[PDB]
Amino acid sequence: QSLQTYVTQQLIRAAEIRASANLAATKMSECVLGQSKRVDFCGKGYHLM
Amino acid sequence: QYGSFCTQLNRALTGIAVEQDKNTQEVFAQVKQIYKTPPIKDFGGFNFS
Numbered sequence: 001q002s003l004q005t006y007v008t009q010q011l012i013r014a015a016e017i018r019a020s021a022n023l024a025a026t027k028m029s030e031c032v033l034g035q036s037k038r039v040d041f042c043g044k045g046y047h048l049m
Numbered sequence: 050q051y052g053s054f055c056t057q058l059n060r061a062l063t064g065i066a067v068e069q070d071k072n073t074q075e076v077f078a079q080v081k082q083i084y085k086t087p088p089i090k091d092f093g094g095f096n097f098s
Contacts, residue, residue, distance in 0.1 A: 005057070040079070 030036035035047060090098065 002052075002054075005054070009061075 027042065030038070031042040031047070032049075035049065036042050037047070041047070090096075
């Protein structure tokens, strides 16, 4: 009952990290490899690089 | 006799609760200042009242 609780928490945690890894790859695409015009997505201000 | 489950359940619900204010902060508190309209409604014929 202790491992099923730990593993259920790691599966939920890893989904929060997944959402953050998907967001990090989405910034590294649009925000580093480009110049995204999406307001406040890429620092406060107008985004240069 | 069942160990840390008690605390693990209290900690987990506290983790959710303390996040609901991170959600409410990041959705609404994006604006640095309390901006206000002038009292007179000279908005081109558009009626935001």
